[PDB]
Amino acid sequence: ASNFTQFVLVDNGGTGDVTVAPSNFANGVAEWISSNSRSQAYKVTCSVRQSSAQNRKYTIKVEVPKVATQTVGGVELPVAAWRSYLSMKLTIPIFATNSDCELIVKAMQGLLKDGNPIPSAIAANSGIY
Amino acid sequence: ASNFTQFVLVDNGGTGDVTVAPSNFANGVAEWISSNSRSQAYKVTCSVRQSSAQNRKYTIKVEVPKVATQTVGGVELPVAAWRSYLSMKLTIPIFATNSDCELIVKAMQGLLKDGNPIPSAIAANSGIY
Amino acid sequence: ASNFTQFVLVDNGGTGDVTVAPSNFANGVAEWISSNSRSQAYKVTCSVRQSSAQNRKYTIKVEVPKVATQTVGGVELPVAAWRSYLSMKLTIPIFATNSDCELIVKAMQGLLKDGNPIPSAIAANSGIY
Amino acid sequence: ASNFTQFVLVDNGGTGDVTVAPSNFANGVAEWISSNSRSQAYKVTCSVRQSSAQNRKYTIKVEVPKVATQTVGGVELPVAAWRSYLSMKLTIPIFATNSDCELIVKAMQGLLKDGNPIPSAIAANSGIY
Amino acid sequence: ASNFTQFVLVDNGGTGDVTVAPSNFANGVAEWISSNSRSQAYKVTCSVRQSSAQNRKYTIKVEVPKVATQTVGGVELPVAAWRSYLSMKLTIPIFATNSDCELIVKAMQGLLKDGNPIPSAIAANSGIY
Amino acid sequence: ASNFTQFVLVDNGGTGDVTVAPSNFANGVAEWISSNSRSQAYKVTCSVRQSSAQNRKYTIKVEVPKVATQTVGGVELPVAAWRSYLSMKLTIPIFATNSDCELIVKAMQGLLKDGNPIPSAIAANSGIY
RNA sequence: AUGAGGAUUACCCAUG
RNA sequence: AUGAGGAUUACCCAUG
RNA sequence: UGAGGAUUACCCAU
RNA sequence: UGAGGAUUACCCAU
Secondary structure, three states: OOOOOOOEEOOOOOOOOEEEEEEOHHOOOOOEEEEHHHHOOOOEEEEEEEOOOOOOEEEEEEEEEEEEEEOOOOEOOOOOOEEEEEEEEEEEEEOOHHHHHHHHHHHHHHOOOOOOOOHHOOOOOOOOO | OOOOOEEEEEEEOOOOOOEEEEOHHHHHHHEOOOOOHHHHHOOOEEEEEEEOOOEHHHHHHHHOOOOOOOOOOOOOOOOOEEEEEEEEEEEEOEEEEEEEEHHHHHHHHHHHHOHHHHHHHHOOOOOOO | OOOOOOOOOOOOOOOOOEEEEEEEEEOOOOOEEEEEOHEEEOEEEEEEEEOOEEEEEEEEEEEEEEEEEEEEEEEEEEEEEEEEEEEEEEEEEEOOOOHHHHHHHHHHHHHHHOOOHHHHHHOOOOOOO | OOOOEEEEEOOOOOOOOOEEEEEEEEOOOEEEEOOOOOHOOOOOEEEEEEOOEEEEEEEEEEEEEEEEEEEEEEEEEEEEEEEEEEEEEEEEOOOOHHHHHHHHHHHHHHHHOOOOOOHHHHHOOOOOO | OOOOOOOOEOOOOOOOOOOEEEEEEEHHEEEEEOOOOHHHHHHHEEEOOOOOOOOEEEEEEEEEEEEEEEEEEEEEEEEEEEEEEEEEEEEEEOOOHHHHHHHHHHHHHOOOOOOOHHHHHHOOOOOOO | OOOOEEEEEOOOOOOOOEEEEEEOOHHHOOEOOOOOHHOOOEEEEEEEEEOOEEEEEEEEEEEEEEOOOOOOOOOOOHHHHHHEEEEEEEEEEEOOOOHHHHHHHHHHHHHOOOOOHHHHHHOOOOOOO
């Protein structure tokens, strides 16, 4: 009926879960932010355009913040100490079938499944070796 | 330890699984590849470097073949019609701790969890609506 | 095999052991980094090149940080109060055989063995006397 | 006491042990030399000075010679076919306590411990891989 | 698990065998040298890059030395009287299957098998006639 | 003698063997070719000349067809997609004796022996790792 | 449009 | 990227 | 090469 | 400071 729904971005098992929701769709860019202060919210944006005459390009961005409380001018303001930025671009030929695309997805899911090299490395501040 | 081992990229539950294994490590850029012709194989590469003075940045690339009507081992042109290209860039501030990084991974896992918008959109040649 | 693996930089028995692992190997420069916040991690880089026509030259570099917590404006970040920098360059003629190198290595080990001058001096904020 | 004494630069058990002893200490530069013909002896020099207002800097230097006999015009002299030159500079902030230095030292010892990368690499005319 | 292992380059049946080992991997160039003095060692290097948009090019080099003992300045130095250089470049289309590549290998093995024209000629300082 | 005879280039053990035979000798450049259309045949050429004043240099070229999905006798374009090109250049100093040359051959044989890195890498569309 | 190019991340740089 | 082009072999030359 | 320097693969002198 | 150099307490670049 619509795919633009809220969804859980960080799953910690019922408690402390980071759920993100639709917040804007201006300029063809779907946005989702966490239920926080715009200054310290999690943000996910997605957009797709037909770049070439034969390709479609999905552009996804995610912002993970480190929440904090800065004291500017002697006043307490909610803020982000720093943000982590994920930026992925997916280019899919138009000849790709639905089944075809499903692979692209599954592949991406596998690439980050627990215990596999890449996420392992990332979660330990190291490279692959 | 050592994290540069083979893993399951596409999980179809036992049968039909696509395993990708290490194939190159020139320039600290790890490369995994499926057991197909380079022309039509699943490719995964990853590397890390300190982009600026405040950040480290993981660069991950994934190549996924179009399989529908594919001709195993054949020569199919144009190349741009039979391959999808994924390109992730993960920027993480030097202040991020191991825990911090685990969260960032979870966020990515969730972004792509089966059933959520982004992946289900890609999986249907759709955008957001 | 590979000699680009993790190893123990600091041996505290089996407790405070400081382990450094591969980071990246771009531009012929191997880099090892300890775990957790890059901001306050140990670093070890190594590289080898043919300096003259008769010599090869190793260039090792080690960084030992002083872990501390920077608090500014009520925002705390894990940082390094300061860092100690080791920088050694080793020149070895091409006429050196494996046997010769072993020797050179043993010399380096001796130079720093517990109880000897240079090491016991450095260890006490002292010089020679 | 004094830490300007003789020590073992190369430990061959109790046989080929290379012992280096005090030579002179002029201009704040300690020098150790092995016995016999200077022309083909081991050399070790060390010195410490206040580089900046916050740092002190050690400068160690080691010379490993390749003993050979030069015969020219029927006249033989004990000389060094060639020499291997080690040159290390260590910078330590003045805020470092004895405890801190011990650490820095242990790091150096580890860096060169048998079996680890850098040492085992140098020992085989090899680099990293 | 890894293909970068030591291997026997010249097989003389257990005795006098010339075995070569990994020695460096800087700049994406795998290197192997014999257990000799860098000045008179056997050397093998390999590297592969994706030259065209549709080709992959393996570049292999081998150095066979004639060991000797030169007397420079009246001193004995280990050295090579001369070196023999092998340089091969292999270009393989990306459409090449694994089975496809296997042929390329077998072909190369056959090309040099004992008793066949080419190696026969080489081993006798003559051309083909 | 006479060494310009047919030989087995690809040995599949009796059946499936690929024999290549002499087909041209213009300009002292010997050419062997398989029994296929020039378009999809195994080709081998070899020649020797004195490159410089100190060296002789064998130039060997090998062309190997892609067979997977090949259509026997058909016209398949583009040519660059169905063929692999090997190009060896062996430089040998004039001082090399027959024995010396035999060794050089052995070195080449070993470089490509079944099971060693280089050949097993090529055989798997892999590089070194 | 490409970039193991960058960020103060729906923007800036370089390139062909 | 090609060269029965070169070497003091991870470099130089010529060419299109 | 520098018992020149640091916010360390980078800056200052021959 | 220099993954600039050596005949190493000294030479070449910012």
